[PDB]
Nucleic acid binder design. Structure first.
Lengths: 141, 56, 124, 185
RNA sequence: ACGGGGAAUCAGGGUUCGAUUCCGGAGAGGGAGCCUGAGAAACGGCUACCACAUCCAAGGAAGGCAGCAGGCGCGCAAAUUACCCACUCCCGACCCGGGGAGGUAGUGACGAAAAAUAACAAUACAGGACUCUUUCGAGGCCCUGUAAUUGGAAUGAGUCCACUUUAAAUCCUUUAACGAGGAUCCAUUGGAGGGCAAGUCUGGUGCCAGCAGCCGCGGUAAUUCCAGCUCCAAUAGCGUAUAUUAAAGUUGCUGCAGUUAAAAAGCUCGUAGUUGGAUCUUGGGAGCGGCCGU
């Protein structure tokens, strides 16, 4: 505190109330700009219909194809690149199918060697991608 | 890019059948030898603190 | 073997009832049912086994003890006055009606169609 | 608007660092040396002291010979004397923190089968208590986490429906009537 | 953004949260007007207009679940069209009356508390405080063992007559007879380079498929992939994703920073705001405490 005075609570609080917006985490959680631009819109998960598949190339020194999925959601009608999490599980996903899509961890950020792909697939039409990969449930059709 | 060789290495691991198992002791029954083996079964020998699975 | 000491005895005269917290001791057997206990204050406090309403045997962790309760009334002329109608069907001389709430709460209210006295052209 | 409780708390601390070798060393010694069921059983033993500590740290820091200090400071010196750890005449509000983790299992019924010399080993202070073959004053106890006070230690004895107390022989001696008295008639 | 009582986290300060059972207010699709009554601007009253919508014999009627179930739509997201006047206490003329209020059972891994899946005796086989002998080996009061040894013992899963329990019972419980040697009464969920507890094991892949929060790993020796094994962590739980708190002394009141890492207005003037020099009753008078405290 640059000012310490005994009657300076209406400058300590008002200055803190101003400089807290320069905190990039605070301003993100308290504006109506970040909250709306989130493809999910303040959701932990979202169902979406697969309308094409994209073999996204790995970002830097690792040369590999990160076989991802273009997904349009139900609640928004906005489009999302969705990473198919476990090994070669794109052959459990077919075009015009409802997939449950989550974030990955870094909270609306591109994680690892997938450039600009912010989301992952969890389920494919009320059978989990784990049970499909582990071999515990059959494809629901 | 190439959505053709998807799950290429999954299929071509020769399916070695899972060797059958006597179930591990559960609850407290796990934690009896786990007391004995760590502390009091062995004598502190010469050298570094070795690993449990350290198969050198 | 039901060694009963009638503990915490108190006479209420504005309900005319002799009440007590019977501390029960009966170790080894199952729970003491309501078939035998009214016959003990027929041989302890020497009143009728007919006007007394004995209940509330509360087991502790082990099951070799309860702590009981009963209320002596003056007569069978007082056996259905300071006693609600739930406990009076529990010794034979009273029975509740059978007509369920999905009839009764509807039977009085199905009659709500046509006006006045003679509403009984709907339900019997 | 229902007459339901909803009043429930946790019993064990959520350990801040997950893979301290020191935690996997020190708090695994609290299994075989004292016979416990899993790591959750080890973790609540501190939390009971964490309850004791949190106020006891502050029940010294009150005003000198203040009746709010001298009652509540002595309200815990009516408490922590009674469980039977600190001395009868040499009780003291300052020695309350001078008190470690197993001081509970020095007094608590989870160990008390082994303590007096009425067990076989350390693990034997679970399996008899798992089958409620003991009591505390004509009152059977199946839960080994009973807080035995100073007073009722000699009253730690056996049930009457117990083949390892003052009772009747049980089921497999009656199921040996299929093997032993099945071949004998 | 219903507010508060509160909640989560918490050295100390703080920070987020409170639609949710208690209290106060507000609303009954949207507004608006009113009758009645002590008390509604009431919608389990009415009258309209605006939207929605079931009859119609096509003239004309009837309607409000943000009461309880149950649909439909919505979504990541949330149960059965169970069971009553018994606590309460209120209403009624009033001890006799009546109340999906209050209130009991289902679906319930939202969660929280307890809690099984071997503790004991001795043959397997190794140790050491120990006697002996250089090591040997025997000897063994005090235990540490655990290996596809023998086992005995039990309370409690599953299946259960009944009652204490109940506005009817069911469930622990109180408890009978019946019900455990891979005690099939069978534990999975994740990682196994580093952070970070735990394999430089073997095949297969060969910058492919993938793993990986971050750092990174794979270029035909992969401790990271895809698998087998053994191990490690937690354990009836655990992995994951999002908001949020601590860590964050990376919002700094306590407690940051501004020569060069981000940063001092180019520079003074200046009004509120903020902060503002020293200075105004001093010592002894009067008893005791074990010169001087009170």
């Amino acid at each position: 505190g640059k000012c310490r005075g005994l009657r300076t609570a209406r400058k300590l609080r008002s200055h803190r109330r101003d400089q807290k917006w320069h905190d990039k985490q605070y301003k993100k959680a308290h504006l109506g700009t970040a909250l709306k631009a989130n493809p999910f819109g303040g959701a932990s998960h979202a169902k979406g219909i697969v309308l094409e598949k994209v073999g996204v190339e790995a970002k830097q020194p690792n040369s590999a194809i990160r076989k991802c999925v273009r997904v349009q959601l139900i609640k928004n009608g906005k489009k999302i690149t969705a990473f198919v999490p476990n090994d070669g599980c794109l052959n459990f996903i077919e075009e015009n199918d409802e997939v449950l899509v989550a974030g990955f961890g870094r909270k609306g950020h591109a994680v690892g060697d997938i450039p600009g792909v912010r989301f992952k697939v969890v389920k494919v039409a009320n059978v989990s991608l784990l049970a499909l990969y582990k071999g515990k449930k059959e494809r629901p059709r | 890019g190439s959505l053709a060789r998807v799950g290429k290495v999954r299929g071509q691991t020769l399916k070695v059948a899972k060797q059958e198992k006597k179930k591990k002791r559960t609850g407290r029954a796990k934690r009896r030898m786990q007391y004995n083996r760590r502390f009091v079964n062995v004598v502190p020998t010469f050298g570094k603190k070795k690993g449990p699975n350290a198969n050198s | 073997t039901v060694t009963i000491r009638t503990r915490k005895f108190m006479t209420n005269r504005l309900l005319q009832r002799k009440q007590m917290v019977i501390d029960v001791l009966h170790p080894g057997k199952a729970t003491v049912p309501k078939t035998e206990i009214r016959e003990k204050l027929a041989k302890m406090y020497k009143t009728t086994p007919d006007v007394i309403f004995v209940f509330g045997f509360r087991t502790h962790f082990g099951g070799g003890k309860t702590t009981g309760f009963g209320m002596i009334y003056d007569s069978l002329d007082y056996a259905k006055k300071n006693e609600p109608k739930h406990r009076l069907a529990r010794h034979g001389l009273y029975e509740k009606k059978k007509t369920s709430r999905k009839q009764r709460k509807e039977r009085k209210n199905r009659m709500k169609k046509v006006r006045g006295t003679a509403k009984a052209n709907v339900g019997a | 608007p229902v007459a339901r409780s909803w009043v429930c708390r946790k019993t064990y601390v959520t350990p801040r660092r997950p893979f301290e070798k020191s935690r996997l060393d020190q708090e695994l010694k609290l299994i075989g040396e004292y016979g416990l069921r899993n790591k959750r059983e080890v973790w609540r033993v501190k939390f009971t002291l964490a309850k004791i500590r949190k106020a006891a740290r502050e029940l010294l820091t009150l005003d000198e010979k203040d009746p709010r200090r001298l009652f509540e400071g002595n309200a815990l010196l009516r408490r922590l004397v009674r469980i039977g750890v600190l001395d009868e005449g040499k009780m003291k509000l300052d020695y309350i923190l001078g008190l470690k983790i197993e001081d509970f299992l020095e007094r608590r019924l989870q160990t008390q089968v082994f303590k007096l010399g009425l067990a076989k080993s350390i693990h034997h202070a679970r399996v008899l208590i798992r089958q409620r073959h003991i009591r505390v004053r004509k009152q059977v106890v199946n839960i080994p986490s009973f807080i035995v006070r100073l007073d009722s230690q000699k009253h730690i004895d056996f049930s009457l429906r117990s083949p390892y107390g003052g009772g009747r022989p049980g089921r497999v001696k009656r199921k040996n009537a299929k093997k032993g008295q099945g071949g004998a008639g």
